[PDB]
Design a protein around this ligand. Structure first.
Ligand SMILES: [Mg+2]
Ligand SMILES: [Mg+2]
Ligand SMILES: [Mg+2]
Ligand SMILES: [Mg+2]
Ligand SMILES: [Mg+2]
Ligand SMILES: [Mg+2]
Ligand SMILES: [Mg+2]
Ligand SMILES: [Mg+2]
Ligand SMILES: [Mg+2]
Ligand SMILES: [Mg+2]
Ligand SMILES: [Mg+2]
Ligand SMILES: [Mg+2]
Ligand SMILES: [Mg+2]
Ligand SMILES: [Mg+2]
Ligand SMILES: [Mg+2]
Ligand SMILES: [Mg+2]
Ligand SMILES: [Mg+2]
Ligand SMILES: [Mg+2]
Ligand SMILES: [Mg+2]
Ligand SMILES: [Mg+2]
Ligand SMILES: [Mg+2]
Lengths: 155, 130, 219
RNA sequence: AAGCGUGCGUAGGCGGCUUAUUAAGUCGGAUGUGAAAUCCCCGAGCUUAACUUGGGAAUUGCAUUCGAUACUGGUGAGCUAG
RNA sequence: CAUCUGGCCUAAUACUGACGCUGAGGUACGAAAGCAUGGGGAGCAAACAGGAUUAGAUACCCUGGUAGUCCAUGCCGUAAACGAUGUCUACUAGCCGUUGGGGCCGGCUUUAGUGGCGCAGCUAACGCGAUAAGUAGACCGCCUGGGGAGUACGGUCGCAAGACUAAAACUCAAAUGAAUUGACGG
């Protein structure tokens, strides 16, 4: 279960005599075969917040059916003001994607994909959108299952 | 006034599927019935029944669910009265790489995109269903 | 199916507070009162009540939730008359989710209820002894029927889908199974073995509880 | 940042249902055309490479002609949910 | 209160047979203030005058007070003219009020309005939620960082006050929305 720390920010809160500082971290975990999850942590120091985030990320994991090591079809997804588009590529390309997206793609076992973010590039909302896009992508088996056909009769 | 009557059928169906209705009933016409039969063959709905009253006919579709989700996930009008589509034969659109159908009107009737690439034709693109 | 129509489960609530999502199991409104469907109650109560024995066979216990003040004094009895856990004072937010939190309270309570009546706690003041007694008694108020658990349950059995939401939500969070007597004024939303019935009556609640304890008795 | 203060209306755009016909949009085939160079692909000369060069592919545009009629348009005949 | 007059709702029965929707230009109407001619003028009251308060007080407060507010006949064409939400059509859980009708046995149901809650969905959030900001279709209007500037010049309109149409050089790296934790409030 390989772990990928995506973002680490320092946030402040006003009190009567000055500022109280703290840290948030956003991390991704996955194995490399179709299971990935993401989480967030908060703490007064950076390693403590990272630990908290990783523990919150080891739940909220999902499973995703994928054609070899690329997507089954093109995916549109969004969370809040962030939009992500993903396309299956053919072997020999890498993950052509930017930052927050890769960690969700690389940690689930995707090796060839064309990906592009529109809208806001907030890392947390981008990771949320990509997660939602992989969670609701379907394979050629569930489609024929729910339609009363076989995998051959459809394509 | 209502001016697209096929988009109205697709909207009635889309709304019923997310209100979890069992059947949906609309006014009927030859093109609506043809499209619903293409939906039935592909396995997206269960049953299609038309019934005439004295002069006007009403059409009743019976929907499908699976794992507590509706079977029609996406249904989209493509060629509206404000912009008609008319693809050729190399340019027929493939919906979700082939895990969905595209309803096409050609001079041999209404069919799906994969069924018209075989015949070597293709006219107006009615809708995408995935 | 006649004992179903016998205990008082015929009537539901009044025809203004009905969660609209429970109409597939509604019959009519007599004197402005909706009635459950016995065909949908007695033929589903048994489909749910098979699972209690089919689980106790492997011997994994099930928690029992009732606190609505009209079925707490029946849940006190009919739940420890079958050798299982119980909770009948309040849902005590975050027990099935922060179990590692309430565990220390349960340990301190077992130590204060095990070393105060069998360990000869002497050489102390009477006022302090009475204070510690009242403290462990209030600690037993909402932890006593769930003392010898040490593990997370395998399924819950509720008496009001409405009044026990902090429990059903926690169950769905932790992925456990849940069975409840959802009435007409209650949403059948996430209780996974749903049984209709008049949750507000002493008789119907007690008859369902007796059937549950008997189902778990064939162990 | 962005619904005219509100109507009514001209050009325009878009328009219910059934049927017969037409074949303009739409779709298919065939024929002529789309200079060479350039871009791309095999491979040949330069010691290699730039570079030069053989053959292809492409130039999916245009026009002419023969067909197909589901949809949109035209024409005739019907209907009553607007 | 009389006279003249427009629309809406509601029930049957009959009739016509797509006669429709939207609309660039164009026209009609359009609060208050203001203008023109002729009247009227109780109360109120821009301007103005005096009395206070004040460091000062061209203000707030007090005593007065003319335009104006009213009528007749015309002009102006603008407002936070706001639901800050174009018009038209269809569809999608429920519960509680209220106005005008129809039906039925105080209550039920239906139809056109007008309010409060609220599932799904939607939204940056706040919120909206059959009177949508949900799901869709038809046509129109408008937006493209802040200032300069809704201004200059040219034109049209107006008695004028002005309205409408509508830039640029130059300058800056922000300006803005919604929510959060403090602090502060005559
Ligand atoms: Mg604004
Ligand atoms: Mg308006
Ligand atoms: Mg016209
Ligand atoms: Mg026309
Ligand atoms: Mg032709
Ligand atoms: Mg050439
Ligand atoms: Mg006609
Ligand atoms: Mg009248
Ligand atoms: Mg006639
Ligand atoms: Mg109009
Ligand atoms: Mg205009
Ligand atoms: Mg005065
Ligand atoms: Mg204005
Ligand atoms: Mg405005
Ligand atoms: Mg009402
Ligand atoms: Mg009424
Ligand atoms: Mg509300
Ligand atoms: Mg809307
Ligand atoms: Mg909005
Ligand atoms: Mg001006
Ligand atoms: Mg504040």
């Amino acid at each position: 279960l390989v772990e990928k720390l995506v973002a680490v920010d320092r946030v402040a809160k006003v009190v009567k005599g000055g500022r109280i500082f703290s840290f948030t971290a956003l991390t991704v975990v996955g194995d490399g075969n179709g299971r990935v999850g993401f989480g967030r942590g908060k703490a007064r120091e950076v390693p403590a917040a990272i630990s908290k985030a990783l523990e919150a990320a080891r739940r909220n994991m999902i499973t995703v059916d994928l054609a070899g090591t690329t997507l089954q079809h093109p995916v549109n997804a969004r969370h809040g003001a962030s939009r992500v588009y993903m396309q299956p590529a053919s072997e020999g390309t890498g993950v052509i994607a930017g930052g927050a997206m890769r960690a969700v793609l690389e940690a689930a076992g995707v090796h060839n994909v064309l990906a592009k973010c529109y809208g806001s590039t907030n890392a947390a909302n981008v990771v949320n959108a990509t997660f939602k896009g992989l969670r609701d992508m379907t394979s050629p088996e569930k489609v024929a299952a729910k339609r009363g056909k076989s995998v051959e009769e459809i394509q | 006034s209502m001016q697209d009557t096929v988009a109205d059928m697709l909207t009635r169906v889309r709304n019923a599927q997310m209100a979890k209705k069992q059947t949906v009933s609309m006014p009927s016409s030859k093109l609506k019935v043809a499209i619903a039969n293409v939906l039935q063959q592909e396995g997206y709905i269960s049953n299609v029944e038309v019934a005439q009253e004295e002069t006007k006919s009403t059409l009743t579709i019976t929907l499908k669910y699976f794992e507590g989700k509706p079977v029609i996930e996406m249904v989209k009008r493509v060629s509206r009265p404000g912009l008609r589509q008319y693809r050729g034969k190399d340019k027929l659109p493939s919906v979700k790489q082939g895990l969905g159908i595209a309803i096409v009107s050609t001079s041999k009737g209404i069919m799906t995109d994969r069924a018209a690439r075989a015949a070597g034709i293709g006219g107006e693109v009615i809708a995408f269903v995935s | 199916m006649r004992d179903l129509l016998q205990a008082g489960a015929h009537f539901g609530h009044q025809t203004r507070f009905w969660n609209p999502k429970m109409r597939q199991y509604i019959f009519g409104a007599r004197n402005k009162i909706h009635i459950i469907n016995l065909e949908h109650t007695v033929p589903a109560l048994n489909d749910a009540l098979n699972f209690a024995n089919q689980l106790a066979s492997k011997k994994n216990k099930v928690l029992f939730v009732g606190t609505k003040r009209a079925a707490s004094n029946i849940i006190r009895e009919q739940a420890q008359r079958a050798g299982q856990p119980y909770v009948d004072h309040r849902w005590l937010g975050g027990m099935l989710t922060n179990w590692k939190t309430l565990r220390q309270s349960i340990n301190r309570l077992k130590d204060l209820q095990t070393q105060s009546q069998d360990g000869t706690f002497a050489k102390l003041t009477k006022r302090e002894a009475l204070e510690r007694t009242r403290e462990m008694e209030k600690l037993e108020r909402s932890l006593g029927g769930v003392k010898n658990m040490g593990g997370l349950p395998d399924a819950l059995f509720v008496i009001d889908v409405d009044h026990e939401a902090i429990a059903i939500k926690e169950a769905k969070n932790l992925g456990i199974p849940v069975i409840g007597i959802v009435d007409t004024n209650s949403n059948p939303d996430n209780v996974d073995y749903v049984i209709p019935g008049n949750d507000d009556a002493i008789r119907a609640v007690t008859l369902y509880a007796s059937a549950m304890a008997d189902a778990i008795l064939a162990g």
